[PDB]
Amino acid sequence: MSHRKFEHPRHGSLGFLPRKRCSRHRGKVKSFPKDDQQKPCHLTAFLGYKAGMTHIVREVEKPGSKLHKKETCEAVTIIETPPLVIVGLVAYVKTPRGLRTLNSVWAQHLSEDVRRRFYKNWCKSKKKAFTKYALKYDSDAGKKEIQLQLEKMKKYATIVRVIAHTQIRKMKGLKQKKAHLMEIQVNGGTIADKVDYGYKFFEKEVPVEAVFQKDEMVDIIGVTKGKGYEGVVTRWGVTRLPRKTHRGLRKVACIGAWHPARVSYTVARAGQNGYHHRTEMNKKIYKMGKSGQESHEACTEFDRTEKDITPMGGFPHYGVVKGDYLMIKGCCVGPKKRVVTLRQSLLKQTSRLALEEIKLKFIDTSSKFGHGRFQTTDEKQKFYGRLKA
Amino acid sequence: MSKRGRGGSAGNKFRMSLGLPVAATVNCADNTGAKNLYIISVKGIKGRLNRLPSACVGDMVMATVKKGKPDLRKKVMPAVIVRQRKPWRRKDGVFMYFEDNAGVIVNPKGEMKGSAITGPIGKECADLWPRIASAANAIV
RNA sequence: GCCGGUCCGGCCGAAGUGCCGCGGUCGGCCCAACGGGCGGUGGAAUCCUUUGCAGACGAC
RNA sequence: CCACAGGGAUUACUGGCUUGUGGCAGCCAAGCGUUCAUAGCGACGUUGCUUUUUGAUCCUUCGAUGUCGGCUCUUCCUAUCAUUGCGAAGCAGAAUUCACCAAGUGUUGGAUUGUUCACCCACCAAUAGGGAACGUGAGCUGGGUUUAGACCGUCGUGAGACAGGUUAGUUUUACCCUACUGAUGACAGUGUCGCGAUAGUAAUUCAACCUAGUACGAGAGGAACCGUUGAUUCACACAAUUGGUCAUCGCGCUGGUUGAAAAGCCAGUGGCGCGAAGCUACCGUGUGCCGGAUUAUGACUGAACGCCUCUAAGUCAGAAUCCAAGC
């Protein structure tokens, strides 16, 4: 050996380490899908805030196995994804020291949004008329400065990127009023056309509906829920130590061997847990829509039935969804009311995975827990109530 | 390559949480004459450090006869798990559980070693082992 | 004639960084890269208070 | 039953030297394998490598190096058990047998025994071996060993003794430095968004279906590649559902108490019985890749040596491994 003996896989990953506070509260992508499609109408990412979880029934697809064709449940995360202001076009250069931004062209209108951008972001909580953000030049003197910058940019072939922010007062459950700034790359066809489309995209907002199609495979990036500080069992998934009693209980035995007389970095030790960056890949985007006013929702008998995307009474500790929304398959990183960023899937084959969509039957809507379903149930509850309902 | 062989199934089709570990005692769902089994092993699990092999609905098992046929007390014989008290989650999304934990004792051919069943079988087991299924009075 | 700051602009430069030219002006044949002043002319954040998506304190 | 002065001047003991012993290898190849040294098996003899058994020594400690075994937890080697790619066969399939490259990931759960070791049982793809002060007591455990009590056997006149067996028989310390995990944190003209030198690693494997009752085969039996499904194992994450909890809060029922019902108290830190948001896992539920360069090897073009030759100058492919892809 030496020992022992009866030997195990080692608990809790090393590619998911350091298990440590993330530097900022809002996730940050180090790489993007490739330019293999349409021009910078294709913004390479979008953002929202996680509302909770709901659930869906869908008409499926596969055929190889025993259960088939037909209705299934699959689990859903709801995100409120209001339209986000692409404020400015950022010009990145390839250099042999990495990318370097050159100059940035700005819309005429961010204007509570830059005051929110000056709130941690910069600091001191926005009361009588401050921080300050610089004003625009005289119009077409400043537009010729900008269009001379466009000239250099669109001759020397900049790898085009966008500054965008979340106009947060379109969410309700964070009762908070502050903008969240991000760097999103713009990807597409040829580089001149790519600058042109990015220019025509900063001089007006962008919704989810212009970057992601329903069913599409999206990589979702967030920062985990924080615990605080923890021991090894709930921070790396190590065993409790068993006897009835013991002068150490949830403990590692040795944090090394006699040699190495120095505790290795790879040993499972206590510390902070949660608030970790993560990219979680290949999420099938089951619906995008709006409370209304886009759809409709679902249909009367049948396909399947009308359900506003909230559980009634609201998503616990969030709120009521009532705006633009994104239903994403399964888990999505974070708590509830945290910035989550969505990016087109990185793994270009490009393939299966998903392909075909998948009739929305139920959303869930609930109405359940002692009562339900909506409409006829609410009528039935009101009959038994009757002065407090 | 594998020392042989067969048994380890096909895609079940559903999700089961393991309910019967090593040394668990279990109903015999046939009339072979066995009438209480003891589970020793599962055809196809691999475990780890300090932890019991546990078995579930649809596993092909070896079990030994704690009560039961003359061919049986204290023979060690193959078996299939037909019912379990710990919930199973279907593709639809319903959870099913049974009253009892039960298996049938099986031939190396995968047929029952008894003439007839007792109690229901989950259809999921019946799919997998169709010569257990074609003795089954009720399928759920 | 030959050089040195300059007004006004372009090319590597994609930053830091530089150079080189159409028409003239202050000049020739100490202090560049840093600075340290006596002087003229000219155009924010921590805290606080209440909270948390955050949290042992601090931090966010 | 001990005590004292000392000694690592000298033992047990860990370490170090050695490496006879042990483990593994090469060479040679008598010989056996129907015939055939080299599919396989392989003696005598012979040269080595390892340092992980044993022995030897007495360098280190006796103003003190905590013992065996176990557990958990990190890391490694390769002489590779499986998995990848290979070559040969006494490789018809096909189970296989031997061997090459190769350490990425796996290498289990139990019955007896303190055991290490080992025996046994079902498993498995297979359930590899070897180091890290026999890794691991300022972690644990405390069964053996190894105090003081006692029995038996053997020996002894006896006290008492045994590498003879047995029952009982204790586990101290508040971390100064250092190490890492995790949180803070000046200089500099500012906050924020970023880049990315570089640092860590994430996917492993199985079953079954398509193919096909085909190939191959007298027959018996019984394959492959993709294409499909699912699950063992690992990782990250969320909590719609199912499952736990639920010492917010509201109900049944005591005993005793506030005169009495009514409304309350105490009986644990919830009297007991019944159940939620949040947190969580019963594997709850969601999410895990082509290209480039190589090894062994199989080839192309090809001389030295007019021929032949896979390589020597050049080149085409080729591993779960390397780089990238990617966090």
Place this chain on the structure above:
RNA sequence: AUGAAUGAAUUAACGAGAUUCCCACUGUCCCUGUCUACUAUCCAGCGAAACCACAGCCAAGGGAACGGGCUUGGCGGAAUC
């Protein structure tokens, strides 16, 4: 290398005595979770000891053959919780 008052055998009752089996049961275990309490943490106040020749990075090597420091290599923004 059993053996008869160094007592042999045998044996009901008794036992915080030694070993083993079964049913009942169960968080010991699969495999961990939530929850209470007092600690912890932070605040005011009170206020200690052990210990201390020593400055105090890692990998190798060397050396009385088990280096925080020699030697060569490699790393390190202090301070503080």
Place this chain on the structure above:
RNA sequence: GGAUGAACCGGAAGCCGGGUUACGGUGCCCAACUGCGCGCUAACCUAGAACCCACAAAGGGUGUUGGUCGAUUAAGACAGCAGGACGGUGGUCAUGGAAGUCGAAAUCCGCUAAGGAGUGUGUAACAACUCACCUGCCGAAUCAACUAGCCCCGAAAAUGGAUG
């Protein structure tokens, strides 16, 4: 001086100053040569007197250089490619069977310019093709053998790579 280093080398030391040296060293770290003439190695062999410390053997190697000796050569070699071989007689033994081609005699000649009773492939056995020798085409060295150097091979270990 030897990376470090009780006992290896130089050297035996009052203190200081200057000069020149010893051992050993002269690409940088590090003063001082990227010194000269020549030759071998391409494995990163390899930067090493000595050392518990620097390993590498028996045995093997058309890697490469070098030395030598014998024989064969323009009375034409070595190799390759191409071309010639009738008859005695289907060679005597032995044996289902050799009959060129299991095993074992025996290897001569007529007829001939060359032309062995034959080198490897055969079918149960019977069935054909090549080849000894000789010749052309080609044109220059070839082959045998001793000896030696270096390198290569044998060559697997444990926290991380080095001759400091």
Place this chain on the structure above:
RNA sequence: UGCCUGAGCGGGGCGAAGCCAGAGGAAACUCUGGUGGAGGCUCGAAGCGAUACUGACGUGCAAAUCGUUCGUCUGACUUGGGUAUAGGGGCGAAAGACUAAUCGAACCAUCUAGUAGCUGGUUCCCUCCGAAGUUUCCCUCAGGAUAGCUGGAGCCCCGA
């Protein structure tokens, strides 16, 4: 450990002596109901003891403590006070147990500044020369002893 003299043991369970009735037998004595209650008896309070977590504590609350568990609890019991027996002696249901935190021989003071071939330490400068780790003896090998190795101080004038 003994002696003297006091004191303490909720409550419950089981049911020995033997005798009544009812009943049998010639007697002997027997059956069934029943009464009464014996006990180093049982389950357990005051009280005693101290098995287990091999827990908590382990510079403690404590120089052996705390919590929960467990044993005894009318007896060879427990316990207050008055009180015997004193150091190779006492006391011991005998373990080398116990004799004021001290027991295979108490504590105190003295002899006493024991004695140690063993460990440790032994305090100002400089100069000239400069070691031995070998040999015999020795109850001798961790020492002595006697040369061997040294060094000073004097006296004199060969030697490879």
Place this chain on the structure above:
RNA sequence: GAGAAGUCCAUUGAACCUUAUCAUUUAGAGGAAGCAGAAGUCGUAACAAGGUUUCCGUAGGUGAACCUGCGGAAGGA
């Protein structure tokens, strides 16, 4: 005036599980040697006053058949 489904109290008063025990069929913890076949060993008891006359209660004790102490008997000299 009749009085459906029906719900309650009381009673006769099923069947599974709670006893606890007895019985039967059984097997069986572990263990004693009662008879037997002929093909065994040990001694020679009893069998003739059996070479110590038999038998008997009783205890002791012996390889065992048995022996003997005490008392009794004649199925005994």
Place this chain on the structure above:
RNA sequence: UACCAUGGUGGUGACGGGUGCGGAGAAUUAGGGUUCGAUUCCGGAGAGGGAGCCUGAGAAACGGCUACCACAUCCAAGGAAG
């Protein structure tokens, strides 16, 4: 079933246990007894095990129900069904 009395029975066998229907009768044997007790005649009893009920003059019902259990059966597998 209330209340009051504590009883009543058994050495002529009570209470209890086991038993490979009771009578009319069968078989024997010269007679006496032994044996046998049954299918038939007669009376009683039970209809898979057990309790209860309606109906009807009469049932506590093999060819009625209720319905627990035991066990077969039908299934368009809901429920019936003996």
Place this chain on the structure above:
RNA sequence: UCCGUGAUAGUUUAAUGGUCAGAAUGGGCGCUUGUCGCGUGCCAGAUCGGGGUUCAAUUCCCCGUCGCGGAGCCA
């Protein structure tokens, strides 16, 4: 495994001073006796294996195989 302690005929077991070896039982042969047995006369060893010393070794040393006893702490 260390210190102690032995061996002699088929079997159990005496013995010496260096020159000399026994017993009992068992067994082999007769006699008892009709025949066995009880009894009665008669008989018969390389002193464990092994080497050395000496005039002469069963006897005196050294080794070894076996069978015995007795020790083997403080873990």
Place this chain on the structure above:
RNA sequence: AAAAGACUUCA
């Protein structure tokens, strides 16, 4: 008033 024991099976 006695030293002293045995003596295969079926016929």
